[PDB]
UniProtKB/Swiss-Prot annotation, chains A, B, C, D, E:
Originating organism: Severe acute respiratory syndrome coronavirus 2 (2019-nCoV)
Domain of life: Viruses
Cofactor mode of binding and number, as noted: Likely affects Nsp15 binding to RNA.
Name of this protein: Uridylate-specific endoribonuclease nsp15
Full protein: residues contained: 6453 to 6798 of 7096
Catalytic activity: uridylyl-uridylyl-ribonucleotide-RNA = a 3'-end uridylyl-2',3'-cyclophospho-uridine-RNA + a 5'-end dephospho-ribonucleoside-RNA
Site residues, Uracil recognition site: S295
Ligand binding (uracil): K291, C292, V293, C294, S295, T342, F343, Y344, P345, K346
Record domain Nsp15 N-terminal oligomerization: where: 3-63
Record annotation: effect of changing T114I: In strain: Omicron/BA.2, Omicron/BA.2.12.1, Omicron/BA.2.75, Omicron/BA.4, Omicron/BA.5, Omicron/BQ.1.1, Omicron/XBB.1.5, Omicron/EG.5.1
Length: 348, 348, 348, 348, 348
C-alpha cells in the first residue's frame, strides 16, 4: 500500500496525500525529493527537518490540512503525539511531534492510540473525527478538542484562532474556536483560567479592540491620559525607550507594531519556533538602539491592562505569575514610590 | 579551452560566460561554487539542479541571455534539446533541457545539430543566429523561431511575450514576438489555431483589455450585466465562491488578482514549473475556505469569454478541448437547465 | 571553558555569545546546528560559509554586535584580521576575515595581537576597547578606529555610517563616525583625501542633499539646467539610456533609484559582497534593455558633480583616478568636442 | 559538564570517554569528527549511523567496553533500551538501541530507569554494576544479567561467549557466561530451554567438538557412517549440493567452513546485522552454483544432530519449532519414504 | 507496482529484485539506503554512483545475475544500452550504461527496444531470453550474444570467460562462451579476428599454458632459450627492468605476476574501470624503481609470442596494430640492429 512513489503521486495530483492510487518516478538527492515531469526533474519537497528526507516528505504530505491548534498551545498542554494525524509546525518547517500513531511506518510507535506504548504519552485527540472523543475517555493521558459539548465533561474555552495550513486565523466560514479537555493518569484535569495570545505579526498587525485602536492612532501622552494609565510606565514597557544604546522595555507586540509603521527595525528570531513568549534580537535602524534579548508577547491590550492594574505596587521587585496559553508565564515586576518602574517577561 | 576556473573568470567579470580568457581560483563545497576574492571565499552559484555542481554552473553561465520563448511553450511543442545554446528554466532554477549540442562537454550528445544522435530529437533552432534557419530545413524533427518571414514556409504567430533573463515581457526596445515553425520526421507541420496565456502574476497583475479593466474596477453584478454574461456562472468560475469550506471555482488568474487586492490568500505552487495550466493549493486567510487542487490559467478575459460563448449548453457535462499555447487543454463543462453550472481546467 | 554546547546555550538565552555558563543539547546535520527544545529539534544556525559548521557557528555567535566599520572599508585599508573580535560580513553571511586572534580555538593563529605570527598582518584595533590604542602603537602593521583624538597621531575622518548587526546607519543615539589610523612596517601612514560611498539601496533610497532632492523630484531637462550640467552627459551617465538593447551608462545608484520608482528592473548581484564599486547584471522589465556588467557606485550627487566638474575635457579618452573609501577607483572618461561623452567605473 | 570538545578530549587521551576534564578543538564536516593536532586536522570518528554525527560520536565514545551480551541475544529477548550504558553494535557500526537512559542529553528519554517513560520498555540491567539488580526488581519490563546467583530468582544460563569491543569470545581471564532474567509487566518470566549459536565465521572457523573435528577431517561418506547419520540428507543439508546451477541446502556454518578451505566462494551479507539466522547471497567461484537466499545458522554440530534425531519423519513436509538464542526458529522439514529430504531455516 | 519500499522488500528477502510483492520501511540518508529491522536501521546499499541514491538502488537490485559479458568487451563493441536488463559494472560499483530500456522509470528512455529513441543506440540483446534474437534482427544498431547457432547469421566466437556477480570465470556447470553478432545502421557487421585478454589479477594469477607454466617456474635466461626468444627483449618487455629509478617495460600481466611472488610492489589503479589496456602507477618497494604510467595487458603468453614473431624488425620505430577484445590496440615497436628494443601498449 504505502510507497514513496505513491506519496509523490498524491502530491503532484492532490497537493498532499489523499489516498489515491498511482505512482510517479522519484529521485532523491541533496536532501530534496524530485519527480520527473516530461523528462526533466522538478523539486517537490526540500527536507528542512532532522528526519530522513523520504520520511519527512511522507509526514509533510500527510499533514493535517484542517484548522488545528497552534503548536504553542499543544506544547503548553504537554502534547507528545497526535492520534492518526500529523500536526505540521510551519514555524520550524518540521513535524510538531517526534513519533506518530498509525500514520507513517517509519515513525509509528503504534497503529492505534489504545496500544500500550501510547499510555505514558499525552496523545492529542480531535473530536471532529469519529470515535476520537471515546478514545480520549479510555486514554490514560490525553488532550481533546471539540466544536461542541462533550457529555459528562466540563469544557475549557480555547483561543479564538487556529492554524489552517500554517495560516493563523479566526474562522468565519469554518470553526476555529474549540473546547479543550485534558486527562492525566486517567484523571480528568480542570484547566485553569488563562489569557490567550493573539498570534499576530508586525507587517500585518490589525487592532482587535477600541483600546488597541486608540493606541495606534493617538499619541503616547494622549493615550495614557484617556485610559488613566499614569504611573504604570507604559512609555517604557509598551512604547519602548530608544534614547539610549540599550533598548528599554518594549515587550508588547502592539508597541512594536506602532513603532514599525513610523520607523523600521530588525527582529532576529534566533529561535524560530512557536511559543507564547518570543525572544528577538532587535536592532533599531533609525537610532542605533539595540537589545540582545527582547522578550515579546502579543496580548490583547485590554488583557495586559487588566493584568497590570491587578498588581500590588508596594514592593521594589517581585515575581508575577500569569497563566497564558495554558502555561504559567513568570513576569518580573519592578516598582518605585508606589508606581511601576518596569515589567517584562523572562526567558523561560 | 574549456575549464571550470575559466568559467568562473567570465562570471565574476562578465556576469556570464562571454568567451574571455582568464582564470580565477575556485573551491567547490556544499553543492556551491566559490571563488577567492582578496583572501576570502565568495559564493558564485548554488546548484539547485539534479546535475553535478560544476556542470550546472557551466550551463547556467552559458545560458541564453536574449529574449527566448518561455519553457512552457517549448514543452508544449515537444522540444527536447536546443541547438548551440542553453535555455535556462528560471521557474525551476535548472536547465530547461537535459542534454546540449555543442555547448558543454559533460552534457553534449553532439557538437552540431546535424549529427546522427540528434535525429530522433526535436531540436530548437533560433533564426536570429546565422545558419540556424537552414539547419532547420535539414533537420528531421525541429522547432524554429524567427522575427520575420522564412522563404517557402508558412508561419505561425507565437505569443506576444518572451523571457529575457527570467523576466517575461512584451518587448518594446527589442523583439519578443516570433514566428514559429515545426517539422516532424522531415515533414513540416501546420501549427493549429491557438490561444496564448498571458504569463502574469498576482502581485503585479495589470489589465490588458477594456474588458479586463472593467472586471477589476466594476463590481461582480455590474460587470456581468455590461458584457451580458448572465447564465455563464462567472460568479463561481471567475470570481470564486468563498462561503463554504471547500473553495468553488476560481480558475482564471484575473479572478484571483481582483480577490488579492481586497483580501490576501496563500497559493502553494507545489509543482514549481512553467506550465500552461497551473495547480495551486489555496488557503483563504479571511474566511478559511481552501481547496487542494485549484487549476489556474491566465487567459485574456476576452479570450475566455470568446470560448465560453462558443459552447453548446444542452448537456449536463461534457469535455471541451481548447488549444492553448500550442497544446490541447481538456476542460470539463457542466450545465444545468441550459446555463453553465461550472467550467474548470483539469490536472493534465 | 569553551564548548559547542555552551555556545548554543548563549545563543538560545542571549541571542549571541555573552560568556554565560550553561549547556543545551546540540545535534549537527545538513550543515546546520540544531538544539532540542522540549523534545523537538530547533534550528539555530545554517552554515553559509566555507568553514566547518561548528566553527562558523562559534564565530557568528561571537560576532561584534557594536557599530563597526563596513567590510568594504576594512578591505580597502587592507585589514587581514581583527584583534580579539569577529567582524561578521552580512553581505556574504560569513566571517569577514579568515583567522582570529584570541577568539576561537579552531581559527586562532594567536591569543594576543602582539605575538610574532601577527607581525606581517594588518590587525584591526578598536580604540573603544581598553588597551587597543596602545596595542596599535606597538604593532608593525595595523588599522585603528577611535571616537575621539589620539595623542600624538594625526587622524583621518572616516565615513558617517557604520554597520550595526548588518544594518548600515548613521548613528544618532550611538557614535558611528570614527577616526582612522594606519601603520605599515612600524611607520604611521597618512591616509589620503577620499570620498565616501553612501551605502544605500534602491528600495529604501533616501536623498541626503538638496541636489539629490532636486534630482529625484525634478525632471531630467529641468535638473540639468538648474545645476548648469550641460555638456556632462548626465542623461546617459546618471539617468541611463534605455532606448537600445544594450543599456547605456547608468552608473550612479541615485539614477537607478529614480528609475525604479517609475519602472522596475532586475539587478543580479552576481558577486554578493561588500565593495566600493558594485557590478550588477541589469534587466529592464519595461523595455527589454539589458547590460551584463553595470558598474554602480553610490556617491553623494554633490560629490560626483564635484568630480565631473574637476576634469579636463580636451582628450578623446583617458583614465581618471579618484580615491573613494580609501582606495583608488580608476574611471574611464570619454569626451568629444569638449564635452563629456561617457564616464563609468571599471571592473577592478 | 558534557560537551563535544570534552568528549573529543577523552577520545584522544583515553581512546573513549573516561570522565576526564579537558577540551580539544573540534571541527565537524563530511559526517566526520576531526580534531586539530599540531595545526592539521585528524579524523576521530566517521559517522556510520542514522543519528547526527556529534551524537553518534558521543554514544560511541561512551560505549560499554566490558564483556556484554551479543546484540542478537538482546534482540531476541526484546530489549529496547539499556540502563545507564551503551551497547554498541559493531556489525552495523551503530548503537544497538535508539534511546538511552542517563547517558547522552540528545538521546536520553530519562536519567534513571525508574522514571515513568521507561516503564513500557524492556530495559537492560547489568548486575555487575551496583544497584542494577535491585533496579530490575522494581522495573516493569527488564532483562538482567549476572555472574552469580540472585537471591529469590530462578536463573537462565546464557551463552558461553560474549562481545568485548566487537570481538566475540569465551572469557578465560574474564567472565562471559551470565545468568539471564526477564520481567514482563511486573511478572518474572521463566526463560525456555534454548540452544545457543556459536557466533563463528568462515575464515577463523574452529571445531568445538569431536564430532565437529571428525566432520572437518574425515570425508563425507566416512563421517555419516561413523555417527550413523544415514537417511538424514546430511550430504545436502550440511555439505551442500554444488552440481546444479541452484545451490541446494548448505544451511550449517560448519558445512560452509569445510567447503571454503577447499574452494572459495562469495558470501554477500546483504543485511549486515547480528541475528540468529543469517541470510547470504552465495556465488560459488569454482562451479558457478549460486543461491539468492541461503539461510545459515551456526549451531554446534552435536546440537543439530540432537535436533534432527528428535523429529518424526512420517510427513511429507511440516514445520519444526526450535528455541535458539531465546527465540523460536521455525524450520521446514521435508521427508520422503521415512527419510529426510531437506531441512533448512526460513527467512523470519 | 514499482516502488522504493517494494524494491527494498525484495532485497531483504531475495538479495535482489525478484518480482515479489511486499513493502518494508525505508529511510534515505548519507547517500545510503537503510531499513528498520526490529527498531534499528540497517544499511542495504551505499550509493557509489553518480545517479540518485534511490535510482542506483533500484538498478543495482535489478542487475543481471546470470553470466554476462565483461564490461570492457561491451565497451569495445560500442554498446550504449542494454535491452530489458542491467549490466552492473563491479569495477566501478555502478551501472555499466547510463539509460535503460523497460527497467527503471527514472532511467528508462523506452519500454521496448523497438521504440524510436532506441534506434541510434547500440542496444545489447541476450539470445538466452525469448524474443531478443528476433528483436536484434529488427533493430538498427545492436550487439547480440547466443549460446548456439543463429539461423542466417555468421557468428563471432567470444571470450572463454564471462562475469557472474562481478566474478570473472570460465563456466563449467554453466555456459560463458557466447557467439557475438553486430549490426550497424541495419547492416550486419563481420567482426574481425581478435585476441582476447585473460582478465586475471596478480594475487590469484594462474598459468593457462605450458609456456606460461614454464615462464613462472623457470628462470629468465632458461625460459628465453627454451622457446627461442633471443632478440625480442623479453627481459625488458615481460620481466621488467628494476635496476634504475624509472621502471623499464613490464607490460604483460604475467611478468608482474612472477615479480609479485618474489617481491611486493604497489599498483595504483588510478582509473578503476574495466578496459583491455590498464594503466597503473607502480612503485617497487624492494628497489625504489617506479613509473607513473605502466600500460599493462593480460594476454596469453602464447598469443603475445605469436604477435611479436609476426612483425618486421627493420625499422627503428613504428606502430603495430593488433585487434584485441574486438578493438584495435595501437602498439609502439622499437627495434635496433634487427632485434626488438622495446614494445609496449600506448595510452589510448
Amino acid at each position: 500500500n504505502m510507497s514513496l512513489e505513491n506519496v509523490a503521486f498524491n502530491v503532484v495530483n492532490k497537493g498532499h496525500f489523499d489516498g489515491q492510487q498511482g505512482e510517479v518516478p522519484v529521485s532523491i538527492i541533496n536532501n530534496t525529493v524530485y519527480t520527473k515531469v516530461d523528462g526533466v526533474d522538478v523539486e517537490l519537497f526540500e527536507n528542512k527537518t532532522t528526519l530522513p528526507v523520504n520520511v519527512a516528505f511522507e509526514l509533510w504530505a500527510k499533514r493535517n490540512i484542517k484548522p488545528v491548534p497552534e503548536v504553542k498551545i499543544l506544547n503548553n498542554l504537554g502534547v507528545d503525539i497526535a492520534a492518526n494525524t500529523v500536526i505540521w509546525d510551519y514555524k520550524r518547517d518540521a513535524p510538531a511531534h517526534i513519533s506518530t500513531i498509525g500514520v507513517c511506518s517509519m515513525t509509528d510507535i503504534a497503529k492505534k492510540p489504545t496500544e500500550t506504548i501510547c499510555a505514558p504519552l499525552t496523545v492529542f485527540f480531535d473530536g471532529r473525527v469519529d470515535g476520537q472523543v471515546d478514545l480520549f475517555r479510555n486514554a490514560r493521558n490525553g488532550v481533546l478538542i471539540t466544536e461542541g459539548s462533550v457529555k459528562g465533561l466540563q469544557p475549557s474555552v480555547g483561543p479564538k484562532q487556529a492554524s489552517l495550513n500554517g495560516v493563523t486565523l479566526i474562522g468565519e466560514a469554518v470553526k476555529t474556536q474549540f473546547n479543550y479537555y485534558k486527562k492525566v493518569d486517567g484523571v480528568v484535569q480542570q484547566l485553569p483560567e488563562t489569557y490567550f495570545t493573539q498570534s499576530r505579526n508586525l507587517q500585518e498587525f490589525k487592532p482587535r479592540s477600541q483600546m488597541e485602536i486608540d493606541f495606534l492612532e493617538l499619541a503616547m501622552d494622549e493615550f495614557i491620559e484617556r485610559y488613566k494609565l499614569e504611573g504604570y510606565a507604559f512609555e517604557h514597557i509598551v512604547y519602548g525607550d530608544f534614547s539610549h544604546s540599550q533598548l528599554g522595555g518594549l515587550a508588547l507586540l502592539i508597541g512594536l507594531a506602532k513603532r514599525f509603521k513610523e520607523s523600521p527595525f530588525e527582529l532576529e528570531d534566533f529561535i524560530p519556533m512557536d511559543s507564547t513568549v518570543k525572544n528577538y534580537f532587535i536592532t533599531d535602524a533609525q537610532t542605533g538602539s539595540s537589545k540582545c534579548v527582547c522578550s515579546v508577547i502579543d496580548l490583547l491590550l485590554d488583557d495586559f491592562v487588566e493584568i497590570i492594574k491587578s498588581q500590588d505596587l508596594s514592593v521594589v521587585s517581585k515575581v508575577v505569575k500569569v497563566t497564558i496559553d495554558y502555561t504559567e508565564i513568570s513576569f518580573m515586576l519592578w516598582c518605585k514610590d508606589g508606581h511601576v518602574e518596569t515589567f517584562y517577561p523572562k526567558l523561560q
